[PDB]
Amino acid sequence: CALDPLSETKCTLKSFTVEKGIYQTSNFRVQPTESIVRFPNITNLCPFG
Amino acid sequence: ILPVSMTKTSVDCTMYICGDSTECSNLLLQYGSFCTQLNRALTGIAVEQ
16 A cells, blocks of 8 residues: 555555555645744843943 | 536544544544444545535
């Protein structure tokens, strides 16, 4: 069930031979990459100077 | 005036009902085959249009 896409098509059904047609065999999602996003800037500096 | 068809639609039950959470999907299989039935019914409706 993870060799060829034809094998996955066979595995979605229960037949060793498949005729002409199109079948949804799996659903895919774009896995997000490793990155983050920022925060608003500092309003002022430290009250220590 | 006579309608002939509506917009074809398909719902991935697993992604819609769980989302990114892999554990929620790993718990869905206790229900057995509801997702397959829903997807098959939606596909049959879509090809009918």
